[model samples]
Target: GLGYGSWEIDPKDLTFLKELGTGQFGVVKYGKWRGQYDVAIKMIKEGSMSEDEFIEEAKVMMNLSHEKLVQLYGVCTKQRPIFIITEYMANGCLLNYLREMRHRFQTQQLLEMCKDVCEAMEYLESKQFLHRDLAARNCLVNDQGVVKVSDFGLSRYVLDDEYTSSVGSKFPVRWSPPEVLMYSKFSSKSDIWAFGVLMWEIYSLGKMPYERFTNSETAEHIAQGLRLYRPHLASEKVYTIMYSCWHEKADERPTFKILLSNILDVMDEES
Candidate 1:
C-alpha cells in the first residue's frame, strides 16, 4: 500500500495551463501543484482507465525512485479529468532533442546518453520490472542534458519477469523483437531489442529504423535475420553492440548489466 501524499492528490490542488501535448492516454499540460510545485499534469481521458487500475498503477509507480526514471508525484482518480502529476521534463522527447541538437554534441556525448539509459535499464532489470515500450520517443530529456526514461503506462512487474500483452496490442513494429511480433511475450530481453533500435534512432539523428519499408515488409525482413544498417555517423564499435541486441533468440541477447558494462568500457577506451 502506498503511504499518504504518495499516491493520492487532491484534484483541486492542481491547475492545468496550456497543453504541451495531447493523446489518447492523456493530455500533458504545464501546470502547478499546490500553487507552488511546477509539474506536468497528464489529464487522463475519461474511459481510458478505471479507478482500481489507476490506483494499482499509482501504487507501483510511486515507489520507483531513480535518476533516469521519471518521477510521479501523485494521481487523481476519484474525480473527473483523472490525471497524474509528474515532474516536468524541460527538453521534451529524446528523439526530437537529438534531431534538433545533433550538431551541438559530440559522438562521445551521444554515447553517454545511451549509457545513461543503460544504467536505468540495469535498475529495471534488477527490480524485475518490464518496460514494454523502450524507445527514443519513450524517453524524455531535461535541460541539464540528462535523458530519463519515461512512458510507463505499459510497464508491469511480474514474478516470472515476463508479461504478455493482450492479443492485438499495438507495438511499434520496427523497435520490437521477433518474439514480440510473432508472439506477445515481453521481457527485459525484448526491451533490449527495442533499446537497440533506440540506439539506431540516436545515431541516425532520429531517422526511422526501417524507413523504406512498410510494417509487413519490415517484419518479413527482420524474420530473415536482417537488422538495421549501420548509421552513417555511428562508430563501428557502437553499431556492434546494437547488432548484438537484435538476436533472433531472446536468450542470445546481452543482459542490460552487460550492456552497461560494455558502454562504460567503450567510454573508458575512448577517454
Candidate 2:
C-alpha cells in the first residue's frame, strides 16, 4: 500500500458526465466512479506536468484526511491521460462562486468560509505539509456551501519546516510573502501569507489581490512593504488578522493554529 493505501482506480469504472472546467494541468470533468460515487475527474494532459513527480506527491497527500480538505479518492495512472479522482464539489470553485454570488453573503458567512480553510491549513501545517498555492481559485464549495481546501498541485511536504524552490521556478506573486518573492522560500508561514490573500478574495467577493498592479509590480511593491488594502466587507478586526499574515518577517506571522483560533474567536463575537 502507498501512504494510506493503494487507490488505483480502473478507467473502465469511470463514466464522464460533463466537462466541469480546465485547471492548471488539464481538463476537469464531472464524473461517476464505479457507477455510484460522484467525483470530479482531473484528466492530466500528456507532458503538461511531470507524471512521476505528481504521482509521488499524490501518494503522500493521500494520507491526509480532513473534513475541510478535499478528499482524493483514487487515480488512474495506467492510461494515456492520467485521471485524478476526487470528491466532487457541487458548488464548484470558491473564486467563481464568490464572484457570482457577490453581495449575497453575510459577513458571518464569509468569516465561516475563512474558518473552514484555516482549519484545513492548520491540519496540513501540523502534518508538516505546505500548500504552496493557497488561494481562493484553488478552493471549492460543496452543495451545503462549505468551503474546502483543494488543489494540491503545487503543495510539497517539508521535513524541516521549509522548502525552497530552485531559481526560475514560477509562483503566484500576489498571494506570496516577501520571503517567497525574494528567495523562493516556502513554509507554513508563506502559506499563511497566501491564506490572508485568500481571505481578502472572500471578503472582496473574488477580486484579484493587488488588482491595480502587474505581477512584477506586485512583487516589487510587496517587497517594499506595500500590503493589500482592507476589503469593504471585512471589519477592522478581520482586516487586522489579514494584515498580520502579510508581515514582512515570516516569523512574525501567526501559525495556522493561531489563525484558526483567531478566526473562531471573531466568528463567535460576530454571532
Candidate 3:
C-alpha cells in the first residue's frame, strides 16, 4: 500500500519544543514542523523499529479518512530518530481536559463531545476497522472545540469484523470488555463496551473506571455483571445507552451508528 507520500516531512523542518507524554513506542512531544504546522511529534530510534513496522503505522493513518479523526501530517522514516507529525490539538487529550476543567462546560457541551466520538466510531465501523483502544484519553480537541478521535496505536482492520489477538497481548484493563480480557477477542462490540466507559469518564469528569479496584478485581467484577453506576451529570436517557453498551453478549450492544443517533437525540432533548 502507498504510504502518506505527500505528507513526508524533513526532520530538519521539525523542531521539538517540549515533551507531551510517553508511550510504549516512544515519547510524544509538542513541536512545530516547517516553521508553521503546530504538531505533536512521536519518535523512536531507527534501529529500534524496522521499516515495515513503521510503515504499517503510516499505512493505517493513510487508510483512515474522517474529519473527526486526527490527520497525520507527515513522517520522517529514514532519519536516525524516526518521528511522526500529526495535527496539534490545542486542548490536548479529552480525559485530562475533562478532569482539569469539567466545571467550565455545560451539559450540552459534554453531550456534544460524546456525539463527536460516536460519529468517529461509526466511521470506523463502516470501514471494518476496530479502534481497540477507544477512550477519552485517546481523543483530542482542537482550539475550535471540535473533538477528534486520536491514537490508532492499538487499532486493527478486519474483514469479518472480528479479531482474536495472540496470547500475551497487553490491553487496557479498565476499558476492555470481558471477552477481550478473557480471550483476547476484539471486535466493534468490544469497542462499544469501551465507549460506555468513555462516556462515564466524560460525564464523571474523567473519573477512573473501577476506581480503587485492581485490574484483576475489576475483571472479576465485570465478569459478574457489575457495571459502572450512572454519573451524577448523566441523565437517565444518557446512562441507559451507556448501560446497554456493557451487555454481556457482544451482539446485544448497539452499533456505533445507532449510538451516534442516540447521542444526537440526547443533544436535541437537552437543547
Candidate 4:
C-alpha cells in the first residue's frame, strides 16, 4: 500500500489530455484526475529509471508539502508505465518560462522568484531532505507566476546530512561546486551551490550556466576557482548572495535558512 492513503491514485481515474513535454525518463502529459482535478502526469518509461528506489524514496517525498513546492499528489504504480501525478503548473518549467518571457520581468519580480525557491529550500533543509537537482529547469511556475521547486524524483533524504554518490554517476557539472565536481559529495551545501546557479539562471533570464564551457572544462574551471559572473539584472548585494553560495569550502556556504532570510532582507530593503 505504501501507506499513500488518498495519494495512491488509481490508474483508471486518470484521463490523458495532451502531451506537455518529454525528458530522459519519459513523457509528461497534461491530464485530469477523476475527470475533475487537473494534474501533470509523468509517465515513466520502463527501464529508464529504478522504480523500486523511486517508490521507496517517495514515501518520504510525498509527505513534503509546501506552498512553494510543486505538490506530489499520488502515484499509479499498479499499472505498467507508472504515473507520478503532481500539481499542474500552467506556466510550466521556470527555465522555459524565463526564456519565453525574457525582458518581461522586473528585478523585483526576479528577486521574488528567488525568494519563493529559497523558502521551499529552507523547508527541505529543515526536514533533512536534499533536492540533489536544483535548477531553473527543475522548478515550475504556476499561473500566478509563483515559482515553486520541483523534481524530487532525484532528491534524497540524508540521514547523516550528506549523500555520497557512486563513482561515475552523472551529475550537472556547471551547477556543481568544487566538492561536488571533484568528490561527488552531496549535502545541503551542495544544494546551496546549485541554488546559486539557479539564481544566476533567473537573473540571466534562462541563459545556460557556463555557456562557453564543456562539462569537463566546467569541472576543471570550478576546481580552479572559476565562478559565474553577475547578471545585468543582479545588483551588487544580490550577486554577493549568489557568490557566497559558490564558496570553495562547502561549510562556507550559507544554509537555505540564512539564504531565505538574507533574500527577504534584501527584498525589504529594496522596497
Q: What stretches of model 4 exceed 4 Å from their correct place?
A: 1-6, 153-170
Better of 1 and 2 by lDDT: 2
Best of the two (2, 3) by TM-score:
2
- Model 3: which ten-residue window has the lowest total lDDT? 157-166
Order the candidates by TM-score, highest first. Answer: 4, 2, 1, 3
lDDT of 4 by residue, 1-271 (tens): 3534665788777899999899666889999988899999988877676687777776677899999999999887877888889999988989999998644999999999999999999999989988888999899999899999988536442222222242333557777788876777889998999999999999999999999987777888888888899999999989998999999989989999999888988898874
Give TM per candidate.
0.89, 0.91, 0.87, 0.92
The number of clashing residue pairs in each candidate reads 0, 0, 0, 0
List the global CA lDDT of all models.
Answer: 0.79, 0.85, 0.80, 0.85
Residue-level lDDT tens digits of model 1 in 76-176: 77777777888888888898888895458788878988988888888888888767878898888877888888866444422122222432234478888
Clashing pairs in 4: none
Candidate 3 C-alpha lDDT tens digits along 1-271: 2443664777778778989887555778988877877998877634444555656667656767788988777677765567777888888889888998735878788888888889889988998877788889899989988889986543442211222242333447788888988888888898999999999999889888999897778889998989889999899999998888999999999999999889888778874
Tens-digit lDDT string for candidate 2 (1-271): 3433486777787899999997546899998988999999989877566677878888877888999999998788877788889999999999999998644899899999999999999989989988788999889999999999997544442221222242223547788898887877778888999999999999999999989888788888987898999999999889988999999989999999999889988888774
